[PDB]
């Protein structure tokens, strides 16, 4: 699936990043849809966390 | 669920730009958007904890 599964994966990614894996790879960045924008923004959050 | 996805993307960017106080919508949902929102809320809290 194109929406439900990617949402689940990104949620797992946010938590991985939140628990302190600033090196996690954020999936779906190459999407041209709402999943793509969401994943691009999750990537920018990750980079923002790389603050310390 | 296109709308909540867009809103959350906007929310993520607001936080990534430095507004670590931006309220994360959709957290009280039972579905996959609900977990996503909570995971983004926990990510918001982490930027602070850091």
TrEMBL record, chain A:
Domain HAMP: 1-52
Species this protein is from: Archaeoglobus fulgidus (strain ATCC 49558 / DSM 4304 / JCM 9628 / NBRC 100126 / VC-16)
Subcellular location: Cell membrane
Chain sites annotated for binding Zn(2+): 9, 28
Protein name: histidine kinase
């Amino acid at each position: 699936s194109t929406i439900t599964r990617p949402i689940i994966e990104l949620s797992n990614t946010c938590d991985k990043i939140a628990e302190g894996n600033l090196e996690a790879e954020v999936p779906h960045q190459n999407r041209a849809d709402e999943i793509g924008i969401l994943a691009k923004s999750i990537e920018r959050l990750r980079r923002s966390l790389k603050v310390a």
